[PDB]
Amino acid sequence: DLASLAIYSFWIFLAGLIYYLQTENMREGYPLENEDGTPAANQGPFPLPKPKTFILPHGRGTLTVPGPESEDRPIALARTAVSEGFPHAPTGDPMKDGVGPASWVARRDLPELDGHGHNKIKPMKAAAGFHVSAGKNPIGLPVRGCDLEIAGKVVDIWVDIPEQMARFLEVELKDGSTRLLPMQMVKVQSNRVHVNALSSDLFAGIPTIKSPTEVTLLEEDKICGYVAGGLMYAAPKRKS
Amino acid sequence: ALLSFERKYRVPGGTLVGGNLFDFWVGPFYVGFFGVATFFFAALGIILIAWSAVLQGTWNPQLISVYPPALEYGLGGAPLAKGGLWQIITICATGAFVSWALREVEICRKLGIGYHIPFAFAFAILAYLTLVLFRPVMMGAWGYAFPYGIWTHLDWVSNTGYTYGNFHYNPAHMIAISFFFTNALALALHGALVLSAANPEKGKEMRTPDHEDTFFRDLVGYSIGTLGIHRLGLLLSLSAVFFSALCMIITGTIWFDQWVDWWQWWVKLPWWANIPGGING
Amino acid sequence: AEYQNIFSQVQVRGPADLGMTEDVNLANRSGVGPFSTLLGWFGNAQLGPIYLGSLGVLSLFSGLMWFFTIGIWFWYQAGWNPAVFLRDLFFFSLEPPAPEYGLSFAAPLKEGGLWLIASFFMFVAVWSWWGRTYLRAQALGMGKHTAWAFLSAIWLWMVLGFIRPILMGSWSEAVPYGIFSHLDWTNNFSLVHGNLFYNPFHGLSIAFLYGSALLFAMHGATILAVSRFGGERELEQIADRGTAAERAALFWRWTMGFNATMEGIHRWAIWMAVLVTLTGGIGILLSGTVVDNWYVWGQNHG
Ligand code: BCL
Ligand code: BCL
Ligand code: BCL
Ligand SMILES: CC[C@H]1c2cc3[nH]c4c(c3C)C(=O)[C@H](C(=O)OC)c4c3nc(cc4[nH]c(cc(n2)[C@@H]1C)c(C(C)=O)c4C)[C@@H](C)[C@@H]3CCC(=O)OC/C=C(\C)CCC[C@H](C)CCC[C@H](C)CCCC(C)C
Ligand SMILES: CC[C@H]1c2cc3[nH]c4c(c3C)C(=O)[C@H](C(=O)OC)c4c3nc(cc4[nH]c(cc(n2)[C@@H]1C)c(C(C)=O)c4C)[C@@H](C)[C@@H]3CCC(=O)OC/C=C(\C)CCC[C@H](C)CCC[C@H](C)CCCC(C)C
Ligand SMILES: COC(C)(C)C/C=C/C(C)=C/C=C/C(C)=C/C=C/C(C)=C/C=C\C=C(C)\C=C\C=C(/C)CC/C=C(\C)CCC=C(C)C
Ligand SMILES: COC1=C(OC)C(=O)C(C/C=C(/C)CCC=C(C)C)=C(C)C1=O
Ligand SMILES: CCCCCCCCCCCC[N+](C)(C)[O-]
Ligand SMILES: CCCCCCCCCCCC[N+](C)(C)[O-]
Ligand SMILES: CCCCCCCCCCCC[N+](C)(C)[O-]
Ligand SMILES: CCCCCCCCCCCC[N+](C)(C)[O-]
Numbered sequence: 030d031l032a033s034l035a036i037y038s039f040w041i042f043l044a045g046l047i048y049y050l051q052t053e054n055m056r057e058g059y060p061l062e063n064e065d066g067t068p069a070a071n072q073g074p075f076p077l078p079k080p081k082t083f084i085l086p087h088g089r090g091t092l093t094v095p096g097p098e099s100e101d102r103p104i105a106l107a108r109t110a111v112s113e114g115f116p117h118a119p120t121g122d123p124m125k126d127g128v129g130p131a132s133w134v135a136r137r138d139l140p141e142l143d144g145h146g147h148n149k150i151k152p153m154k155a156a157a158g159f160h161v162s163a164g165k166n167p168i169g170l171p172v173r174g175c176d177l178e179i180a181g182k183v184v185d186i187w188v189d190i191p192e193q194m195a196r197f198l199e200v201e202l203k204d205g206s207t208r209l210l211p212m213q214m215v216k217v218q219s220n221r222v223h224v225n226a227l228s229s230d231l232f233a234g235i236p237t238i239k240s241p242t243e244v245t246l247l248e249e250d251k252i253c254g255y256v257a258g259g260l261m262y263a264a265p266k267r268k269s
Numbered sequence: 270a271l272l273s274f275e276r277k278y279r280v281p282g283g284t285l286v287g288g289n290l291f292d293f294w295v296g297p298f299y300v301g302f303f304g305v306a307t308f309f310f311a312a313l314g315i316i317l318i319a320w321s322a323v324l325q326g327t328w329n330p331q332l333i334s335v336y337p338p339a340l341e342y343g344l345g346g347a348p349l350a351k352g353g354l355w356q357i358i359t360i361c362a363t364g365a366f367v368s369w370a371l372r373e374v375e376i377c378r379k380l381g382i383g384y385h386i387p388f389a390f391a392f393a394i395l396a397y398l399t400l401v402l403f404r405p406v407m408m409g410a411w412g413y414a415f416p417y418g419i420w421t422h423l424d425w426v427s428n429t430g431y432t433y434g435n436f437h438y439n440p441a442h443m444i445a446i447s448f449f450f451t452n453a454l455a456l457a458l459h460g461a462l463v464l465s466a467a468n469p470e471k472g473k474e475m476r477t478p479d480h481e482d483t484f485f486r487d488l489v490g491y492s493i494g495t496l497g498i499h500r501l502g503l504l505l506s507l508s509a510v511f512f513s514a515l516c517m518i519i520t521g522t523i524w525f526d527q528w529v530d531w532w533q534w535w536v537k538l539p540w541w542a543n544i545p546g547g548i549n550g
Numbered sequence: 551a552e553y554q555n556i557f558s559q560v561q562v563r564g565p566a567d568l569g570m571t572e573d574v575n576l577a578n579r580s581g582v583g584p585f586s587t588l589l590g591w592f593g594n595a596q597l598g599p600i601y602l603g604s605l606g607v608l609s610l611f612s613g614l615m616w617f618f619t620i621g622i623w624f625w626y627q628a629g630w631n632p633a634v635f636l637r638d639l640f641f642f643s644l645e646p647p648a649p650e651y652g653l654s655f656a657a658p659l660k661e662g663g664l665w666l667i668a669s670f671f672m673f674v675a676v677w678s679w680w681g682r683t684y685l686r687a688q689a690l691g692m693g694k695h696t697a698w699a700f701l702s703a704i705w706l707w708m709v710l711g712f713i714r715p716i717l718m719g720s721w722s723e724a725v726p727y728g729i730f731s732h733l734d735w736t737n738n739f740s741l742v743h744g745n746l747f748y749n750p751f752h753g754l755s756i757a758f759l760y761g762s763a764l765l766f767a768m769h770g771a772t773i774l775a776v777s778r779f780g781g782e783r784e785l786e787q788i789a790d791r792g793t794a795a796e797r798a799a800l801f802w803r804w805t806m807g808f809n810a811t812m813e814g815i816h817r818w819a820i821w822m823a824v825l826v827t828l829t830g831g832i833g834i835l836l837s838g839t840v841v842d843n844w845y846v847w848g849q850n851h852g
């Protein structure tokens with residue numbers, strides 16, 4: 030009857046929907062590759078969807094996906110086995126080389142912009158008149174690493190202007206230069222800011238930004254990847 | 270076999286047990302010690318279900334059902350064909366689920382990401398355990414647990430609920446439901462909002478999160494923001510399950526009468542219990 | 551113990567954000583409301599502005615009139631006694647006309663007339679609110695995904711209070727306005743239709759409801775887990791994939807053998823959610839119009 034027709038139709042619809050959804054979700058990262066970067070023989074049963082194009086605001090261009098995929102950066106890893114499916118060992122210092130959990134993506138070397146075309150993220154000192162509105166103000170506190178040594182001191186908060194949120198702490202090092210630390214990777218305490226991801230000796234290695242009052246998407250990725258990578262790679266210098 | 274961007278993340282390390290022994294992939298799947306454990310537990314579980322099927326004398330997926338020991342067995346063991354298989358399958362399930370969570374932890378550690386996902390999953394596991402382990406233990410028999418069958422588990426839900434009248438009257442169940450409904454509402458809105466920004470009117474530039482905040486302030490006078498919405502979805506879905514587990518752990522233990530009668534405590538308050546008129550006077 | 555980004559450690563505030571202009575009639579925006587530091591631990595601290603406009607006024611007025619029509623009936627049932635009002639709050643109920651009145655608007659006020667009036671106000675409130683989800687997206691140049699999603703919820707609501715009663719031939723089939731009574735209505739509906747557990751559209755609606763919680767737990771946890779790489783900035787991750795979007799995808803590829811993108815997760819999201827009420831409204835609409843007894847139907851499969 031009509032209910033039988035409804036249910037049968039629904040299942041046909043649902044198969045169609047899942048096919049649509051899976052192929053939509055193949056707009057990045059496909060075709061699949063062998064470990065050497067060449068196209069894999071087996072691409073699975075879903076084909077790539079027809080490309081769509083996103084128009085980016087503020088003259089930044091467009092993005093068309095699916096599109097030719099490439100890392101656009103060297104990857105300092107090598108095989109540890111003679112067959113597919115094993116780990117790839119860092120050929121150098123994985124924190125410096127940006128691989129494993131220290132990885133970064135070659136994102137656009139421009140700052141993310143707000144809806145008005147201004148830099149989305151700014152040091153609070155340059156953001157009129159943004160200020161700490163609740164919680165312990167981290168500015169001025171010593172910054173301790175997982176080796177329990179002081180690596181520097183907080184000199185500003187970098188804030189997301191349209192979303193009114195703390196995004197980074199700016200930390201000045203012993204040599205007077207600064208680095209950005211992701212807000213998600215620090216613990217603000219009463220007398221210090223604690224960073225479990227990095228021992229104090231790794232702070233100098235945090236990727237620097239090219240201009241002192243802005244940060245590009247590329248620079249954010251290198252900074253965040255490097256800091257997260259310390260969880261695995263500074264484990265020898267941590268320490269309860 | 271690899272996403273185009275995948276290789277740089279496939280480094281050694283992050284394992285919880287076994288060092289490098291199981292540090293590898295099979296096609297897309299990470300293995301790890303807990304991948305091996307999941308396979309063992311799942312495989313044994315599935316084999317035992319197929320054996321339970323033989324003893325039941327059916328292979329139909331809509332008919333296969335693995336029932337726990339009858340109430341007379343209390344919390345003891347039972348013959349395999351009479352509840353023992355359920356008991357072993359349940360240990361297998363638990364082993365598989367917990368192994369799955371711990372394998373998710375190894376994957377987090379290799380990827381340098383937060384542990385939020387397996388943390389969240391552990392809520393679902395705790396709800397499963399409330400029904401098959403915690404509640405039956407507190408009530409004193411395995412037989413109060415649900416059977417493993419597609420339709421029989423629904424018989425269990427209906428029979429269990431109607432034991433206490435209309436189960437709608439469980440107040441923890443009311444809260445659980447509210448979180449379920451609110452979660453689906455927020456899921457719809459989040460999905461829609463992001464897509465409406467990423468896919469604007471024809472020919473227009475992608476909108477920004479400023480536009481997402483704007484749309485929602487225009488609409489209801491508030492926007493939780495892009496961080497807040499993901500905090501929210503996580504909170505609503507975990508709260509729904511927390512209150513689901515709560516609503517069942519208190520049923521047949523601290524409250525075992527008709528749930529509708531629980532509400533009399535409010536009606537019977539001295540100040541108004543005896544004023545005429547209304548529904549209850 | 552690491553920081554988990556469930557609550558913020560430090561809040562910042564700057565000038566009140568008045569929002570994007572695009573094509574919005576700015577004459578119709580309120581001023582900004584207060585700032586709530588409480589809210590700001592978890593979400594945005596800012597309240598307002600809100601957009602008013604005449605459609606806005608209509609929905610609000612209508613919605614209030616719906617609420618007040620029910621509330622006046624409740625006071626009446628309480629015999630105008632505040633103590634009895636609060637005591638019996640969850641027990642009062644504004645009920646639809648008796649079956650005998652069919653679909654006519656000729657029932658007495660105290661016996662269904664008032665239910666129809668409240669229902670009328672609800673109808674205009676919801677539909678004018680739907681218009682508003684479309685128009686606020688339009689004025690901003692945005693897609694219409696919100697109004698499309700809202701329409702799926704509206705579908706179940708329309709099925710329950712309007713389409714199913716019309717097709718059954720009487721307002722008596724609709725849902726009463728009351729806390730306990732709507733629950734009794736729900737239980738009764740299932741009992742009277744041979745147990746909704748046998749309605750495949752009810753089982754589907756459940757799979758999607760549970761699936762919504764599974765999916766929001768998955769997505770919310772994933773985004774928080776990659777917030778240390780800016781993962782919640784999803785629009786710019788769509789435009790320019792970062793290590794947040796890659797680590798998220800790979801968590802899932804390594805776990806379950808497949809994954810999403812930053813854009814496409816939002817499509818699994820919207821559909822998982824809207825299919826709750828889409829399949830639901832279908833299951834209810836068929837109940838009593840085409841199928842009297844789901845258990846019986848299920849025995850014939852058809
Ligand atoms: C007639 C029946 C009664 C009823 C009696 C009951 C009873 C009895 C129960 C509920 C429970 C639920 N009811 Mg009730 N309730 C009814 C009316 C309703 C109505 C309604 C609109 O009328 C609603 C919305 C709800 C909703 C609720 C939810 C709060 C809750 C179910 C979700 C849950 O526990 O998730 C928690 C999620 C899980 C348990 C899933 C865990 C799974 C994980 C760990 C692993 C599985 C994966 C594995 C097998 C993989 C497969 C292989 C492949 C990999 C895929 N009920 C009526 C009145 N209700 C249940 C509850 O709260 O349980 C705690 C419960 O026991
Ligand atoms: C949660 C509270 C109640 C309960 C209430 C109900 C009610 C009421 C209904 C279901 C329904 C479902 N339940 Mg149940 N169910 C319970 C506990 C479970 C458990 C468990 C704890 O292990 C499992 C695996 C299931 C699984 C099932 C599915 C057969 C079906 C769709 C669920 C879904 O899409 O979820 C969301 C999750 C996803 C979308 C992910 C996909 C996972 C599913 C599809 C996996 C199926 C597993 C199944 C075939 C078991 C095989 C295991 C193998 C041996 C490995 N339920 C407890 C007892 N469940 C519906 C149904 O139609 O049943 C006939 C239904 O109406
Ligand atoms: C004894 C009870 C029966 C039963 C009888 C019913 C009945 C009857 C129905 C359901 C329905 C549902 N049941 Mg059932 N249900 C049973 C047992 C279960 C169990 C379980 C046992 O674990 C579960 C999990 C569920 C789960 C579900 C859901 C999947 C589904 C509702 C989806 C929804 O989002 O609605 C919530 C969403 C809405 C109602 C949409 C809201 C619409 C908008 C327009 C809101 C406007 C509001 C505004 C004007 C007011 C604003 C106020 C604010 C302050 C601003 N049922 C048992 C067998 N179930 C529904 C369904 O679809 O079934 C097929 C339904 O009609
Ligand atoms: C807590 C919020 C919600 C939630 C969260 C959640 N679920 C999760 C996770 C999270 C964050 C994932 O990380 C994990 C996942 O990998 O998802 C894709 C998962 C997951 N949730 C899943 C299912 C699921 N979650 C559910 C519910 C929920 N999950 C909550 C609503 C339900 C419901 C509502 O019924 C189901 C069916 C899986 C898709 C996945 C976990 C997969 C897994 O543990 O794999 C290892 C085990 C096997 C491969 C099979 C084991 C076989 C057994 C040994 C035998 C079978 C016994 C079983 C008890 C019989 C049941 C018969 C039924 C008919 C009753
Ligand atoms: C896809 C399925 C899920 C879903 C989707 C969904 N719901 C939605 C949306 C979508 C995508 C909309 O965009 C729309 C929305 O605007 O959300 C914010 C909405 C919405 N879903 C709502 C509720 C709701 N949705 C339901 C759930 C669900 N919605 C499903 C689970 C439920 C359940 C589970 O029963 C409820 C109760 C509303 C919050 C909103 C629709 C708002 C509306 O139609 O308003 C009409 C009435 C009024 C304008 C006001 C009524 C008056 C109040 C009773 C009084 C108190 C408040 C008052 C406004 C204060 C003002 C006083 C001033 C004068 C000071
Ligand atoms: C303290 O006193 C004050 C002044 C504050 C007042 C207090 C107010 C109170 C206590 C209000 C209480 C309200 C309650 C308890 C509301 C509960 C409502 C519930 C639970 C509703 C649930 C189901 C609702 C549904 C499904 C209704 C759907 C209705 C429609 C689809 C509308 C259909 C339109 C019809 C039939 C009208 C036909 C007219 C035309 C021509 C369109
Ligand atoms: C599309 O994403 C969403 C937001 O929009 C950016 C929200 O804002 C909210 C609403 C959040 C809350 C806390 C409601 C209560 C409001 C106050 C004033 C306390 C929801 C559900 C949502 O889904
Ligand atoms: C909940 C719907 C069911 C989801 C499972 C279907 C999607 C699996 C797609 C796997 C394909 C992955 N692949 C080969 C394209 O890389
Ligand atoms: C939009 C956030 C509001 C959540 C609404 C969900 C309804 C649940 C009822 C709230 C009671 C929960 N609690 C823990 C405060 O008791
Ligand atoms: C569903 C979420 C409800 C959000 C609550 C609405 C807050 C409105 C604040 C607008 C303030 C307007 N004001 C006071 C400046 O006139
Ligand atoms: C966005 C779509 C995700 C696909 C998830 C589909 C889950 C289907 C579960 C099968 C339930 C079938 N049944 C018995 C309820 O009719």
Ligand SMILES: CCCCCCCCCCCC[N+](C)(C)[O-]
Binds near residue numbers: 807
């Ligand atoms: C509804 C549950 C069905 C289980 C299948 C889930 C989809 C997983 C597909 C991933 C397999 C990818 N592959 C082919 C490379 O192995």
Ligand SMILES: [Fe+3]
Binds near residue numbers: 463499773
């Ligand atoms: Fe998101």
